[PDB]
Paper text:
[name] is an opportunistic pathogen that causes the potentially fatal pneumonia known as Legionnaires’ disease. The pathology associated with infection depends on bacterial delivery of effector proteins into the host via the membrane spanning Dot/Icm type IV secretion system ([name]). The Dot/Icm complex of [name] is one of the largest known T4SSs. The Dot/Icm [name] has as many as 300 protein substrates, a striking contrast to the H. pylori Cag and B. pertussis Ptl T4SSs, each of which transports only one virulence factor.
Numbering used by the authors:
A (entry chain JH), J (entry chain IH): 311 to 361
B (entry chain IM): 113 to 320
C (entry chain If): 208 to 266
D (entry chain ID): 23 to 162
E (entry chain IK), I (entry chain HK): 38 to 188
F (entry chain IL): 42 to 65, 88 to 236
G (entry chain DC): 77 to 152
H (entry chain Id): 24 to 160
């Protein structure tokens, strides 16, 4: 799984991460159905299908 | 050397007296300066006088006044009780006592300083009482309408105000308890700029 | 030998040593173990001596 | 005449009961390890010399935050009307702080923030210049 | 879309407008400009005379405005209080600080969602009216709640 | 005419309102008042609340549940239990000579020093509340104990809810 | 379904008690896993009794992470 | 007239036990952290002071990564200060990275010395209008 | 599960409630706090004047006592005997000990599923009433049965 | 048969036993449908299903 | 001492005697693996396990 956001990722444990000048985050990680994200001091869940 | 009474515009100034106990009665402008190491228990002032006593070495005292004298006393004693129903003003240097019971009714301005284990204060109206520079473990305060109280309890603080009255706690004790009935006010009144001021804990937190 | 405050009037302070020895101190005097008292702050529980020590209350 | 006993709660849940019965033992183990680490550790100083309080720092807050550090301390500084300062290079792995408190003052909020930072991050303050200065630690 | 909510949790903008209208006819200042929001309440409907004792009937109105603040989505809220000049500066500052602390604690006890509640008080530092002849009846004695709307 | 926050610590009037709403028969109103303020009726109201009353020998004790009557982990007393607290003061008006002991206990879990501190704070809060209702301080003594004598087992959940409590004892002479 | 609702009903206290993040070592290292044992007795067969007072065994060796774990992947 | 209790009140014994257990373990972890953390005294904490020269109060935006040498030199040129270096540049150059939009050159140099740490130091002389870089052998 | 027991043998909490109400109507005091229960019996209903001997009518009372006492899974029963100040310390201690021994032996003779009986007597060292006019009619002269309910 | 409890076991004679820091016991023994334990000086039987 | 991993098991079913004889019967049934001491002026009851193995 390759993912781009500007948030903080929590759940699976990623393998590689990159950050832009503007704080945009990119991660290479394993396949997973769901994600855990700290957004603004709040805990959130993300749903990903199509695996 | 045990009896002292003066009335009618009397000015006495003296020092270097050693005694165990003498009883003092004063009236009508007794300008009394006594700067000896004087131990005594019973003093009475009728009203309209000024008295400075510098040096008190005694371990019991019980004074109650009726008019408006003005006394400044240096030394220390175990004060037991105090009642005022007139125009009382009082200032005292040091007290290392056990239990205190203070009652003020009509008009009072009291400044006290020392170490007390346990004290009770009843203020009715027009009473400004200071517990600044005076520390207590058990504090009990009952304040009625138009009363002003300062409390510096160390261990345990207990206070109720009925209405239109001000209470200021100059130190956070380890235990706090306050109540307001109609318009009573209980407030910290501290500098907010002390470099080493402690904060609240789990136990000390009360929300008015 | 250490000391702690008991009650502070403007001008004089009450001290107790580690051994229970009492003291009443003016603005300017001499105290062994601390030197010369340089300022009595009665607004807060701090007094500064010549040697550079500040007396607080014990807890 | 009808007999009662005081604590009348809502009907409970077995799952909550089992979580509690694990939690008591966890708390006991954490307590005893804390006391033995306390007695084997000779403490030296507290963080008051590193960060004192000041006037206008007496404003208080209550928080429940479970994320990174930077946005939280930025909100703290903007409440403080203090100028921000950041020192050190940002780590790849984010420093994650979670505080769920109840009505504490700004100074001790920042003080226990600096305590829960650990070795990664540190906080200094300067009231004479009104400067809040965070510093990452140069490891590796 | 069966698994995705079309709106935020139990909300109705018609109810938002209606409760804003009811508060404005009640006598509570509601301010909406940009995407930031401000609410001002006079203290004479809140406390006793120069005293942080809470009136029992005011708990209903506090519950209602707490429900309104729960109805929005936000991150951080500043709550402050101002008053008249009575004895000192410190007395007024401490009175406003205590009042803000109490109302913030009750608000956190209520089910509003937030991460940050900021408490401070000033008393009579920042006036709002040249006319200051009233006491606690004077409208410059007030409580303000300010926030910025999330997203 | 009444105020739920302790009526500004004033000696409450109920009989005048009773006789007013019963005259709006006065004799039936007053016999209903003496039936409604009687001691057995007071204990029945305390039984309707979650308060335990034990009368044995010359000593009498009252048992208060802290979880029912307090905010959690706080010295702050809950205010919703004001009918119970007013009935407590109404019953306590009947013994104007006996000294009062008040003590508090918790469960086992936590620091021993911390739970002793919390019990001391709870007991001092309760004794301050009853001191504010016009009782002389010479008749009082407060104590926050730890868990050194438990009426219920701590490891069972319902017993752990039972053992954390506030006890009030009084003698008679 | 009921137990998932009741589990997520008290989400914040679970993170309060299972602070993995404070337990993470200083070089982004998960600390290893140790198991204790007391009063060991073994009866292998007749004429054979082997006892010990205490013992300790490593379960999982220490390794890296990117994020500390949570209660969800163990409990949801 | 009316007032609700707090909505997520622990109205069950298990919930009560959970909440107090959480309180206890968080307090114990706070104690462990407080006895764990090593701090520095503010008397002799080694960091760059504020030289507060009048030309040192300018503001800029700088993004840069790499060796400290020409960065310090061009900063000194922007500050009209003479620049000198005592010590040896090793085989590996000391590399930092600054990405700032608005802060002054004084705290820029302070952070430069902070990321330098043990390897090198920056000293400012406002009497003889110079800035120098000291290596450590 | 029909093979498994459903409740304890011979157990009915309604019967427990009924006999408890009957005993408190009789005047024998039954106290319940936590899991430790107390049963107080005045000595005048059981023994004669200063007597280590019972009338025949006491056996029905003790029989119903044992019938109630079957209804709990417990471990230890403690029985204390207290008397009135009559002659000495020796006579009161001996008489209380004898009374406790007699009631303990009859209790073990009845089939109470117990583990341990602890019996002691104190005479008149700790009364519970300052009004001490009566002799064996005194209320503090009594027998107290204490136990802890176990799961 | 692997059993975990905090009680005391009497009848079959376990092959191995371990005790926790708090005193919970774990026993290793043969297969048996029944067991005989002691609670507080009082004997008790115990039933095991699903062998 | 410390309790061995094999437990010590005691069956006692008696009737109405003093605690001294109770404890004497207890240590007699204990035998060679454990013992009982009482310090009366110190008000201490103590057991000791066998220092064997």
């Amino acid at each position: 799984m390759y993912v781009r956001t500007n948030l903080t990722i929590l759940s699976p444990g990623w393998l590689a991460s990159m950050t832009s000048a503007d704080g945009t985050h990119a991660y290479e990680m394993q396949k997973s159905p769901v994600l855990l994200v700290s957004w603004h001091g709040k805990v959130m869940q993300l749903k990903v299908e199509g695996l | 050397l045990n009896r002292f009474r003066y009335e009618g515009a009397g000015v006495v100034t003296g020092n270097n007296l050693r005694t165990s106990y003498l009883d003092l009665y004063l009236a009508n402008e007794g300008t009394t300066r006594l700067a000896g190491n004087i131990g005594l228990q019973k003093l009475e002032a009728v009203g309209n006088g000024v008295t400075q006593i510098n040096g008190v070495s005694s371990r019991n005292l019980q004074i109650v006044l009726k008019g408006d004298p003005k006394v400044l006393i240096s030394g220390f004693v175990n004060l037991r009780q105090l009642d005022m129903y007139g125009k009382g003003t009082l200032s005292l240097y040091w007290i290392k006592s056990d239990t205190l019971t203070i009652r003020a009714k009509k008009a009072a301005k009291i400044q006290l300083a020392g170490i007390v284990n346990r004290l009770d204060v009843e203020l009715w109206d027009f009473a400004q009482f200071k517990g600044k520079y005076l520390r207590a473990q058990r504090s009990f305060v009952k304040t009625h309408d138009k009363s002003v109280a300062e409390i510096s309890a160390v261990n345990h603080q207990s206070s109720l105000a009925t209405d239109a009255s001000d209470i200021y706690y100059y130190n956070l004790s380890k235990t706090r308890a306050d109540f307001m009935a109609f318009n009573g006010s209980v407030l910290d009144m501290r500098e907010w700029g002390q470099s080493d001021l402690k904060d609240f804990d789990r136990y000390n937190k009360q929300f008015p | 030998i250490i000391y702690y405050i008991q009650a502070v009037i403007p001008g004089r302070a009450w001290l107790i040593g580690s051994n229970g020895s009492t003291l009443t101190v003016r603005e300017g005097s001499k105290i062994p173990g601390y030197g010369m008292v340089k300022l009595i702050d009665s607004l807060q529980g701090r007094i500064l001596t010549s040697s550079g020590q500040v007396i607080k209350f014990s807890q | 005449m009808k007999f009662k006993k005081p604590p009348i709660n809502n009907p409970s849940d077995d799952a909550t009961i089992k979580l509690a019965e694990a939690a008591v033992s966890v708390s006991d183990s954490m307590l005893e390890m804390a006391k033995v680490e306390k007695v084997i550790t000779p403490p030296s100083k507290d963080n008051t010399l590193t960060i004192p309080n000041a006037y206008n720092l007496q404003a208080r807050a209550s928080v429940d935050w479970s994320g990174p550090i930077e946005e939280l301390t930025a909100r703290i500084a903007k409440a403080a009307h203090f100028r921000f300062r950041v020192l050190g290079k940002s780590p790849s792995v984010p420093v994650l702080i979670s505080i769920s408190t109840k009505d504490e003052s700004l100074a001790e909020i920042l003080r226990d923030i600096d305590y829960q930072a650990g070795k990664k991050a540190s906080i200094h303050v300067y009231p004479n210049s009104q400067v809040v200065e965070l510093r990452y630690a140069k490891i590796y | 879309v069966p698994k995705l909510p079309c709106r935020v949790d139990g909300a109705c903008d018609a109810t938002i407008i209606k409760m804003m209208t009811d508060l404005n006819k009640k006598g509570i200042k509601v301010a909406s400009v940009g995407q930031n929001y401000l609410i001002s309440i006079p203290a004479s409907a809140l406390f006793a005379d120069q005293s942080p004792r809470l009136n029992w009937a005011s708990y209903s109105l506090l519950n209602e405005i707490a429900a309104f603040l729960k109805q929005f989505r936000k991150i951080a809220i500043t709550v402050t209080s101002y008053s008249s000049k009575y004895v000192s500066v410190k007395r007024e500052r401490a009175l406003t600080l205590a009042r803000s602390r109490v109302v913030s604690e009750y608000l956190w006890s209520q089910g509003v969602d937030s991460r940050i509640i900021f408490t401070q008080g000033l008393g009579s530092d920042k006036p709002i009216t040249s006319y200051t002849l009233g006491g606690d009846r004077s409208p410059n004695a007030r409580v303000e709640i300010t926030f910025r709307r999330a997203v | 005419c009444f105020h739920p926050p302790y009526n500004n610590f004033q000696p409450d009037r109920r009989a005048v309102k009773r006789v007013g709403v019963d005259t709006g028969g006065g004799t039936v109103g007053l016999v209903a008042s003496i039936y409604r303020d009687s001691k057995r009726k007071i204990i029945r109201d305390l039984q309707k609340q979650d308060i335990q009353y034990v009368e044995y020998g010359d000593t009498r004790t009252l048992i208060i549940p802290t979880d029912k009557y307090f905010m959690f982990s706080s010295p702050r007393l809950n205010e919703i239990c004001y009918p119970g607290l007013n009935n407590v003061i109404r019953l306590l008006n009947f013994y104007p000579q006996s000294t009062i002991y008040v003590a508090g206990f918790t469960d086992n879990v936590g620091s021993r020093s911390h739970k002793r501190k919390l019990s001391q704070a709870q007991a001092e809060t309760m004794m301050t509340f009853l001191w504010a209702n016009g009782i002389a301080a010479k008749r009082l003594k407060a104590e926050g104990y730890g868990d050194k004598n438990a009426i219920s087992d701590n490891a069972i959940i319902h017993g752990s809810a039972q053992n954390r409590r506030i006890e009030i004892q009084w003698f008679t002479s | 379904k009921i137990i998932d609702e009741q589990l997520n009903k008290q989400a914040r206290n679970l993170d309060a008690i299972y602070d993995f993040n404070s337990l993470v070592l200083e070089h982004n290292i998960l600390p290893p896993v140790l198991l204790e044992g007391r009063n060991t007795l073994n009866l292998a067969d007749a004429q054979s009794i082997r006892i010990s007072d205490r013992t300790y065994k490593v379960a999982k060796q220490a390794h890296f992470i990117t994020t500390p774990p949570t209660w969800r992947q163990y409990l949801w």
